[PDB]
Amino acid sequence: RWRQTWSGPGTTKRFPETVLARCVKYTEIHPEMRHVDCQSVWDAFKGAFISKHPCDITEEDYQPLMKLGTQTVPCNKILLWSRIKDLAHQFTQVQRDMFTLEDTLLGYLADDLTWCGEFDTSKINYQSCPDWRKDCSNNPVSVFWKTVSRRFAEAACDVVHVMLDGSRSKIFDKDSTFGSVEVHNLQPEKVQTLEAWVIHGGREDSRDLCQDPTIKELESIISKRNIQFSCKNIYRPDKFLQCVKNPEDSSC
Ligand SMILES: *[C@H]1O[C@H](COP(=O)(O)O)[C@@H](O)[C@H]1F
Numbered sequence: 001r002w003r004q005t006w007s008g009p010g011t012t013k014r015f016p017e018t019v020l021a022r023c024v025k026y027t028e029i030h031p032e033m034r035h036v037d038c039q040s041v042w043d044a045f046k047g048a049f050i051s052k053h054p055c056d057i058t059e060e061d062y063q064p065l066m067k068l069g070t071q072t073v074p075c076n077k078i079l080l081w082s083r084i085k086d087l088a089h090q091f092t093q094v095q096r097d098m099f100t101l102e103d104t105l106l107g108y109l110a111d112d113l114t115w116c117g118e119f120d121t122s123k124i125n126y127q128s129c130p131d132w133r134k135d136c137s138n139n140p141v142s143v144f145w146k147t148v149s150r151r152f153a154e155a156a157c158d159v160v161h162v163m164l165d166g167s168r169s170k171i172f173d174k175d176s177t178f179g180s181v182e183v184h185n186l187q188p189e190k191v192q193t194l195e196a197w198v199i200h201g202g203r204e205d206s207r208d209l210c211q212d213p214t215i216k217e218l219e220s221i222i223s224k225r226n227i228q229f230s231c232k233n234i235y236r237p238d239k240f241l242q243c244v245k246n247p248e249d250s251s252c
């Protein structure tokens with residue numbers, strides 16, 4: 001038609017085939033996931049949102065999928081990130097012992113994808129899907145990420161690291177998924193310290209951004225949860241990348 005139901009982009013093309021293929025690839029590479037039945041995972045993923053009103057999705061809708069995608073992640077090697085997707089993933093593609101959410105099976109399946117269904121019908125909506133702000137918060141994509149992000153934060157222990165973008169207006173943003181979900185789901189019983197890495201923009205290599213007002217807000221929130229807060233400036237991201245990629249580099 002000339003008119004779309006929703007304001008957000010619609011389901012990604014070939015969504016069913018892509019989720020299936022990503023599940024196949026992941027379960028072949030990661031030996032602990034050998035037992036996973038990819039067709040079952042996809043069936044669980046479909047059942048969460050097909051035939052459901054795309055503004056009435058629940059965390060319970062995703063429970064069969066969460067159960068099939070159960071994964072033990074090394075609890076002390078978690079990298080959270082906020083608003084600095086590319087660098088965080090470049091880092092874990094090189095430093096293979098550390099994991100972002102998108103390096104887990106469920107995160108990897110859904111990364112950069114959009115999906116929604118229609119109430120009272122079995123089809124996937126390839127035309128449009130609800131936008132979190134303009135349409136509704138309880139939509140398939142938003143509910144998925146809230147659910148898996150909580151579970152990922154709950155798995156963390158010891159020192160948890162978070163990469164933040166120092167070139168942004170709000171380096172720490174309380175309204176981000178990091179700030180609204182992950183920070184409040186770290187377990188004080190298990191997590192000793194949250195350590196922030198504030199990644200500077202090009203050019204500005206001097207200001208101590210760990211004294212930034214929003215970092216101080218993060219510190220206060222974390223401290224009041226009985227978790228220690230630590231912060232480091234990455235003043236020059238080029239040198240940081242040089243050193244991550246080649247840690248024998250005697251300049252590092
Ligand atoms: C969960 O949320 C952050 C990325 O979301 P955002 O803060 O950029 O909104 C990651 O740490 C994921 F684990």
Ligand SMILES: NC(=O)c1cccnc1
Nearest residue numbers: 101102142145146149177
């Ligand atoms: N909630 C989200 O949009 C999101 C995006 C990327 C990683 N984790 C969470």
